[PDB]
């Protein structure tokens, strides 16, 4: 019906994917997918709602229940979302990955009559086509986009980006049988495409975010208040985590450039509260603002109006997992060098990182802390290991040296949490980072740790110590 | 001589006029009546019967209401407008099939109670489709007339 509020944001090295899992394709360029903005807004809405409930009600709720509650504001299969997003990006040119000539004509004759895992490398602005059969022919190409070698350095000096680049750089061509210069040209051309589109990593991508509102369409009894809470959660999402891939490692970190309202009776309490972030003084003051917004969500806003209505549903521990926030783990610092810290995050979130070697020196406990907090890790029963050792520090029936421990994680008989913690490959990292910085040259670093619902014992002060130390060492 | 089919249609419309409490359900049953007799004339009985049971949504909640309408008089079909329209018309058809002894009422009621024997009901109906389609014509025409008489349109 009418425009609710506008937001002008900015992302730190957004890693937005697409159908080809890159930010650019032969057809269009999308650096900010509003689909991801809505999805992440809803994810942070559920996170914030479970946070608010856990504090002022003690209990938690499943995701399906939570978005059944917000159905009238975020839409569902039985209702159109009342809020329409519209991402408007500055420099929204008709960009498209145009590859003029690759001029191979030689590697084709290299790999014929054989099978080779042709790899790729970008040493010193010179794409070389490494061949596992011991050949490193330097490829000469011309593409539409250009990489200032700042991005090449960013990718090469970052153990994280360079890791996910493993998939986008190799093909195990088998040409001992049927082979042809025409089809190998197509293969290697699409491979150079798939590898060069990886390096579209801009930095400081700004954009506007219009948010329209079908004003009434009908006025349910408790709509306006769910709307205001959803806006609160949108603000939180902008302040914590950002768009794109690897947001738990700082990439695509959002930061407010500007805000605006167009129905004061709804959003003014968010416009001023976000203008708050239009200029940050110091890391302590930023952490103060973060505690302020979380506190406000807990007491200085609508804190309990409808939770007592029977549409939600209690979670079931040992079978369901939800993420809420502990407002005490928010370790802000100052960085003033973004590439360095983005590369250094790996020194913290890896089993063999310098900035985590020191804090948790056991080499059998670091694994436990990470598997518990660092998303998914790949562990297999080969040596006297996890099933023997980490199982101790994760099974709740243990000794307090490793305070954290899972709910249904049993000695040699972990029923369901054993798999979800050890064998489920898609698990976000509770330990997350961010690089908010705007309108003043100074730049900060949030380091927070989401709170799960599969901890049946947690030492807040201990992991807060670990997180303080982490947020210190990476800088 | 007898026009017993008109008597049966009368004593069945008596029932279904006192189960569709909401008026819209009456108007929609009238819509079903003015149409399904033509459909059963043209496209035979089995296709029309399938189209009726499909639009009826014979969930066990409704089936109890029908098995009660068979005996009780304080029964009430529950559901939406169209669902109870097709449920009432299914009851019309089944009433005729029972009273004229084409089916055994014990068997029919035992079928509607179970979630499986309804398939056997439909099968036994399939085996009797010619006789049923020859017999039920006057009954359904009487029901159509009663419906368009005793019910205002929309």
């Amino acid at each position: 019906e009418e425009l609710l509020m506008s937001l002008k944001l900015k992302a730190l090295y957004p890693l937005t994917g697409g159908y080809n899992r890159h930010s650019i394709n032969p057809f269009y360029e999308e650096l900010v997918r509003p689909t991801e903005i809505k999805g992440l807004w809803r994810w942070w809405n559920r996170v914030l709602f479970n946070t608010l409930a856990y504090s002022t009600k003690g209990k938690l709720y499943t995701y399906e229940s939570i978005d059944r509650l917000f159905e009238d504001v975020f839409g569902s299969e039985n209702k159109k979302s009342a809020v329409r997003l519209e991402v408007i990006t500055d420099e929204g040119n008709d960009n498209r990955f145009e590859l003029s000539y690759v001029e191979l004509d030689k590697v084709i004759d290299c790999l014929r009559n054989y099978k080779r895992k042709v790899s790729l490398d970008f040493i010193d602005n010179t794409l070389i086509a490494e061949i596992e059969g011991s050949t490193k022919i330097p490829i000469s190409f011309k593409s539409n986009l250009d990489i200032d070698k700042i991005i090449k350095d960013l990718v090469h000096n970052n153990k994280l980006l360079s890791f996910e680049l493993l998939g986008f750089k190799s093909v195990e061509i088998d040409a001992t049988k049927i082979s042809d210069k025409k089809i190998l040209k197509e293969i290697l051309r699409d491979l150079i495409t798939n590898y060069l589109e990886y390096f579209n990593i801009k930095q400081e991508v700004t954009f506007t975010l219009n948010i329209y509102l079908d004003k009434s369409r009908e006025h349910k009894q408790n709509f306006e208040d769910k709307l205001k809470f959803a806006l609160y959660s949108l603000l939180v999402f902008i302040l914590l985590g950002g768009i794109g891939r690897k947001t738990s490692r700082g990439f695509g970190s959002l930061s407010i450039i500007d805000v605006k309202c167009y129905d004061n009776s709804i959003c003014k309490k968010i416009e001023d509260l976000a203008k708050n972030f239009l200029k940050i003084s110091s890391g302590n003051e930023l952490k103060s603002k973060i505690e302020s917004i979380l506190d406000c969500i807990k007491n200085s806003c609508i804190d309990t109006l409808y939770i007592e209505n029977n549409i939600l549903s209690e979670i079931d521990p040992k079978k369901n997992v939800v993420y809420f926030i502990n407002s005490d783990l928010f370790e802000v610092k100052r960085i003033n060098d973004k590439e360095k810290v983005l590369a250094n995050i790996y020194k913290a979130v890896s089993s063999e990182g310098c900035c985590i070697k020191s804090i948790i020196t056991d080499k059998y406990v670091r694994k436990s802390f990470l598997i518990a907090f660092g998303g998914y890790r790949k562990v297999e029963k080969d040596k006297g290991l996890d099933i023997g050792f980490i199982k101790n520090y994760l099974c709740e029936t243990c000794e307090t040296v490793s305070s954290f421990n899972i709910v249904d994680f049993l000695l040699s008989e972990g029923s369901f949490m054993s798999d979800y913690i050890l064998q489920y490959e898609h698990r976000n990292s509770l330990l997350r980072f961010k690089l908010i910085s705007d309108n003043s040259n100074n730049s900060y670093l949030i380091g927070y740790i989401l709170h799960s619902s599969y901890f049946k014992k947690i030492d807040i002060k201990y992991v807060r110590c670990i997180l303080e130390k982490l947020t210190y060492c990476v800088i | 001589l007898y026009e017993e089919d008109y008597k049966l249609a009368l004593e069945a419309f008596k029932k279904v006029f006192n189960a569709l409490t909401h008026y819209g359900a009456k108007q929609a049953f009238r819509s079903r009546a003015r149409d399904l007799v033509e459909e059963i004339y043209n496209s035979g009985f089995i296709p029309t019967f399938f189209y009726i049971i499909s639009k009826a949504e014979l969930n066990s909640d409704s089936l109890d209401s029908l098995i009660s309408l068979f005996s009780s008089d304080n029964a009430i079909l529950r559901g939406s407008d169209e669902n109870v329209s097709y449920s009432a018309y299914l009851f019309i058809i089944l009433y005729y099939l029972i009273k004229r002894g084409i089916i055994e009422q014990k068997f029919l009621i035992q079928a509607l109670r179970c979630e499986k024997t309804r398939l056997d009901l439909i099968d036994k109906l399939y085996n009797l489709a010619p006789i049923i389609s020859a017999k039920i014509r006057t009954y359904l025409l009487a029901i159509k007339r009663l419906s368009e008489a005793l019910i205002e349109a929309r």
């Binding site: 299969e77 039985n78 209702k79 159109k80 079908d214 369409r217 009908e218 | 169209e82």
Partner: protein
């Protein structure tokens, strides 16, 4: 909808007829030629020129050897004469198939579009508000005959009205723009 390799021109669609339809056309022409002074030797010749070559699929004016019609029916064709005039005055080819393969190809050649109704209050599809509709493709040709008896009003009817009847609106759903159609008057076409 046709898909075919090895043509000098790739066609996107093609007209399709069966021998039974042409038999009905010839029947209309015969009947009205018995019941009137009118005689249409041009149409009758063009039609039985085809009907002679029945019992197999025929392409009037093209080089289509074989094709897949409506992505389901593979047909092997054979040209008729590459000389016979076009009754459908458009260079688009005219397949004439045997029946029992043309019956489906034509039943399957219509357009079933699905429509819905939006629940204005929650902006989703209403319950029980979804249906399909058959349209007939644009440029479909229907043959028909208009007849009249002597009245001196009939003469006037055929003297300016049928000389000024060009386009009309048939069937329903006109507001979806689905009615417009044009009449040809064979007597001034052939």
């Amino acid at each position: 909808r046709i898909i075919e390799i090895d043509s000098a021109k790739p066609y996107v669609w093609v007209y399709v007829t069966t021998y039974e339809l042409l038999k009905k056309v010839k029947l209309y022409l015969d009947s009205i030629s018995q019941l009137s002074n009118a005689s249409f030797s041009n149409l009758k010749n063009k039609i039985d020129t085809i009907l002679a070559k029945e019992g197999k699929n025929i392409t009037l004016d093209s080089d289509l050897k074989s094709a897949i019609l409506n992505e389901d029916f593979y047909v092997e064709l054979e040209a008729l004469n590459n000389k016979i005039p076009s009754i459908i005055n458009a260079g688009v080819p005219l397949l004439v198939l045997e029946d029992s393969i043309g019956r489906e190809v034509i039943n399957r050649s219509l357009i079933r579009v699905r429509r819905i109704r939006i629940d204005r209050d929650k902006k989703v599809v209403e319950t029980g508000g979804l249906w399909s509709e058959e349209y007939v493709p644009m440029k479909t040709i229907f043959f028909s005959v208009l007849l009249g008896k002597e009245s001196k009003e009939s003469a006037i009817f055929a003297s300016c009205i049928l000389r000024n009847l060009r386009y009309v609106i048939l069937g329903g759903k006109e507001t979806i723009g689905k009615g417009i159609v044009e009449l040809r008057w064979v007597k001034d076409v052939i």
